[PDB]
Symmetry: D5
Subunit: 197 residues, 10 copies
């Protein structure tokens, strides 16, 4: 199993046609430099878990934008299908109007670069990538088809990475804003471990 997506390395470059505010526009990974990016793939337009994930992120977009973070979704469907899906009512399993870009990957090049393409199925699994403001890949979350991801966990992870970027302390298991962190040194670590126990 291959992939160019490697944590602590620059996220693999991508560019393509996206639907943005109902129109076709060219979108590039580099458009997002200077901001964190939640870049996630979903299997297929007009299916089941997928709309719920796209809608979940879209409807909570301000929780990301308020922390200098953007969100882009991608699938192997065409831009025409993305737009048709946006124009399908939510009650019919459509997206309705959406504020996050829907990127099209008809050739599968982007999916393969990110290691999320399913050769037997001709679409991706549920792969989500957290990329920092410097374009470095920090986190990879891959789900099998029948189980959707979590916006809340994605937010926690974004906050965690921004926190450690800024402060140089590290984040324990389950860390959320306000939680105790650790000075990553054999002596400094004791402040955390003695206070906790």
């Amino acid at each position: 199993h291959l992939s160019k997506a490697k944590i602590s390395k620059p996220a693999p470059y991508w560019e393509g046609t996206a639907v943005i505010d109902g129109e076709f526009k060219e979108l590039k990974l580099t458009d997002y430099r200077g901001k964190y990016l939640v870049f996630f793939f979903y299997p297929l337009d007009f299916t089941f878990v997928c709309p719920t994930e796209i809608i979940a992120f879209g409807d909570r977009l301000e929780e990301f934008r308020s922390i200098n973070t953007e969100v882009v979704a991608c699938s192997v469907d065409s831009q025409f299908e993305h737009l048709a899906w946006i124009n399908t009512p939510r009650r019919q399993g459509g997206l309705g109007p959406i504020r996050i870009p829907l990127l099209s990957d008809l050739t599968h090049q982007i999916s393969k670069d990110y290691g999320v393409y399913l050769e037997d199925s001709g679409h991706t699994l549920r792969g989500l990538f957290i990329i920092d403001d410097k374009g470095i890949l920090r986190q990879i979350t891959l789900n099998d088809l029948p189980v959707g991801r979590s916006v809340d966990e994605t937010l926690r992870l974004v906050q965690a990475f921004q926190y450690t970027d800024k402060h140089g302390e590290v984040c324990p298991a389950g860390w959320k804003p306000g939680s105790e962190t650790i000075i990553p040194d054999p002596a400094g670590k004791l402040k955390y471990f003695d206070k906790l126990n």
Copy 2:
């Protein structure tokens, strides 16, 4: 990496510390149960003990849903045991009920695609493996940020639910939430009701 979602999780075997003793442990020992199998970078470091303890102190939440937990690093079994015998207040683990698997040769780490060639240890990679030995979920964190027991629980529960019912789990699903019939007509029960 041999770790591919929807395929058999790559076989592994090695020496682990279990109840303070050295024991040979094999992936196939867990068939019939879900397994949360996770790597952590290094004994005697910082985020790592918090992760092992977080899972360890909540182990019964897993065992009660037919799920086991195993942790692995490139450290030796002697180091694992010394770390267990180090007080939590000193950044140690204290007694622990989760097996600590040793991967000195790096073979297991490489098979799971979590080995860092530049560093000589793993990143924070967690794998959810079902009772049939099929890999269902991969979570990989860069070094500075720990994983989440809450999210791991949610995922195991979701996969067990979808295994049983064949309905699929929306974004953010937790026990008691609405699920979807994966059928062009059936799905409307979910989409219509929600909206």
Copy 3:
């Protein structure tokens, strides 16, 4: 530039999920043995020329069925997209109910086997294949994207191939049922050439 589609050789085997009467069904090339098959690819669901070709064949399907000929359409879109497109009114560029199976080629395997896949675009061009009842490929028609195919011409070709299969004769340029044909030998041919000259 490669392909497995060779005229006078067995048409490359295919199988996949198709929409048939609003339901997802597995469909195989071999299901059509015993009958002529018009098997055509079109670029993309929810686009422009494509629906007009599918509707043109669909609305004239009995002209094919009455001559022991079936019609199957294929694209790189998913079965869910095919069904959503069927459920889109014709006035909005949808298909409406359709009696031609719509085959899904998400992996691009079928398209590549037939040599109609566009690597730069992630979809096929307008490729149509006429396959006889023995499974042998008899005719290949490839159009660039902007120009739709012709049901009249396709029908004429099916009739011609069926006619030459049955009789010891070959069909001159522009032949339609009822037109003069030629006996393919140095002496027999003169009955044709003397007649019309």
Copy 4:
């Protein structure tokens, strides 16, 4: 199966000896730049369907020339055979005098570049190619041996490609001059679809 002939790419260059106005002349693909070109192969001089196709295009040549289009025929026969066939009466299965060039491909190089050469037979199948004024290949039509092509369909295609070149609307299935066309975008397309339905 291999070939250099790819739709939307430059038609493979060719050059050779042709019979033109009863004389041997060198002829090149690039001689037709600035005009559309119907370039077609036929199996064999002194056979059956072939003369009918050559005669059909030749006798209707003005229908092509009046729309800035030329026609060239090609086979694996020699220029001496082409000329002897021209000097054979139509009632004997000859061509009689002819106004389209008859290109010779004795080495099979041109046939192979166009993917129409039959290795087991030592001649071509019925392959026809429509090449635009910029030298780009737009259309490929390949028939098995028993069935002749259609001058009328060939004209329809040339007209359609010239129309879409000029207007940037696209041509529905069965389009002929005077027919409705489609604006190729998600909103503009509704002019066509709402009107027709």
Copy 5:
């Protein structure tokens, strides 16, 4: 430069369609076992030297058949062309009725096996082969395009090979029936050399 034609070895096998007494028939090299065969290639039907060679052998065929020798001619032209050429009057550069089979080699496989195919021209040079009753190649005569072969020389050679096949002795330069031969032995050869000197 490659070839399978090797003197003193079995002549390379061939089989194909020939025109024989106005009909198309399958012909094989092995059809001629038990007789000497003069098997010759000529460049092109409807050309200049070629018919003179075919006619020269043809009109003297009984001089070959009276010494148990058959003659076969072959070119890269089709059987249809061979027949049309036969049906062309000699005064127009045709063959008229011919008793020598005309083999067709459209694929060029026979020509290439015999090493006489011109890659730059798409036809053969003037290559003649003398094959004995055991199928062993005994003589190869290859002429550039402008110069015809000789029936007299070909007859001399066939007679010489038959003579040496039958008797112990070998044939000096210029040998014709009735000429002195040589005993191929350091002592025996002296009968010849002493006599002539």
Copy 6:
């Protein structure tokens, strides 16, 4: 089976030690530019047919020199053997004095370049080559071991190639000086074919 001797291409270059008027001299193919060259191989000094061929050419040398043509013979024997053979009386199967250079090819390099070397025997067959004044190979005549070549035919051929070189008409089967030739043109050729028939 390979070779560098290709008709209508430059004869393969050779150089070596020859016996010329009883002396050892270095000789080169290029020494013969500006003249036709009959270059011939023979199997073995002190054998049977070989001396008859060398003598047949040598004794009629002036018939070649009067038409600007030279003759060179070659074998795999040494120059020392050539000279000893020259010094052997004709009545003993020797050559006697001779004005044709005898070229030595001990390494077999020249023989292999001309495709006349017999791997099983360690000497050449009877291969004769006609090379024109421009160094282009025009004719190849290869005989099996038991049958000698013809000086008359070789002369006829040289005369023919020289004629066609000069006049650009072509020589029919059996042409000799004074015979009718053909203008190589579909119209021009009728002067010959009408006259003859």
Copy 7:
């Protein structure tokens, strides 16, 4: 990945993180140029023979430093483990404070370069290397796991190499300071051999 450690060649370069007086420091082989270096690997922190070796050298360090020799130990454990082991009481199988750098080789690159890595075990055997002030490898001692090395023998060897470096006389079996040495010359050697015997 072959061993690069060759006696009489430059010791393979290494660099890494070491614990030195309780702190993490980058350490390089080249930091030791100008002095002899005893560079030794041990299997595993927190085991059995290993601490006894580190302590044996550690406690006798001045015996090395007084002969201008440094000592460095290395294993496949991390710097964090080295530090934790140093902070473990000797009574519990720990090191206590230590004046020898503990080098970490987590990636195994160094161990493999020195040929001491055990592929089946994931750690080194007991390999000790003596490297001179010019960086040349002079001595290799490899022990299987259950048997510890000797500080006495190590000292003896360092002294012998320094003696022979200085004087160019060579050191007999069992040499210690004050022992007889040999002039490496066929005549000079007799001073040793005669005195001894």
Copy 8:
């Protein structure tokens, strides 16, 4: 740099001619099964350090034999040289009285198998191997040319391996008979570390 000698694996098989009690005898590694073997190479007969090593081990052979251990020495010299050297008095740099076999390795096969051959010099460095009674290699000691090995250290090592083989406790740095050993268990080890500290 390669070798077949690997600690904890079977020592590479060897066999060859040795001088034993003044006579040439074939000797095999397998002759020593059931006993420990100190197998050592030395550079060259008639040199300097080498005789002192052979003499040192030989003169102390009973200290090995009384612990079920044999000693064999090997160099790239011939058996004839070994014997002449034995017949040379010690005062002349010869071996004089001797009881250990001197194995000859003229082809360098054995030296290369053991990884002690010096390609630049044509002889071996000072490599010593300790092989157990099961034929497993336990210890490797390699010295550069100017410095001899130690009989006392070799004895210490043989005794240590025999002790660990027997008792399953392990030997600390500098162990000698009578010294403290360690139980290789995280609990059992404490008996040693608490006692010593």
Copy 9:
């Protein structure tokens, strides 16, 4: 430089046509089993040193036959040349009276197998091989072209090999029948060395 002739191995097999008692016969290396064979190549019939060598060995053949040894000579010349050279008087540089076989190696296979072929010259150097009664090659003597070999040295060598075959003592430099020989053992050799000194 390559060859199959290796001292102490079976001499490479050969077979071919030889001149024996003025007749052509097939001859094989194995015809000589049970006898020693002096097998030698010479460059070229009708040259200079070569006849003196053939004559020298031949005229003294009884000195070989009376010690169970035969002699065979070989060159790259033909059997016809060998015979012609035999029939040439010695006073003219011929062989005249002869009793040793002259082997022919036209293909150079035998010469190449024995490593005596000169690729630049097309003949052998002066190579002589002494092969024993068991067919094992014992001695190789290779001379550059200008210098002849010695019958007396060859006899000395044949006698030496037979003596050592029979007695198992070895022959000192310059040994001839009746000379002292050596017992090849460190003690036995002293009989020779003490006596002679």
Copy 10:
């Protein structure tokens, strides 16, 4: 079986340590430029035929030096062994003082370059090489182990090669100074052959 030693080509370069006048010196083939060199290998110091060969040349050395010819001997033994052997009395099979350099070839490189190395034995056979003053190899003499070479024959060959270098003449079988020689040309040779016969 390969080698770099080719007659008529530059002798393969060598350099190494030799014993000269009882001392070790580096010696190079190029050191002998301007003089003939007899360069010979012998199997083993302290053996049987070998000393007799070294002594036989050594005791007649002035017969070589007086004709500008040097002698060098070489074996796979060390320089230390050579010197020890020199210091062994002749009556004990030693060399005693010697004026011929004894070259050491411990690595076997020189022996392999000259094709005299025995892979199965780890030493050379008895190979002798005569190298002229320009460094060209002129003669190779290879003996199996049990039979020594000849100083008489070696001197004869050196004399002959020197003679043929100086004069335009070649040396018959068995030539010694004062013997008749041949002028190597077809006419001049007769002066030798007529006189002898």
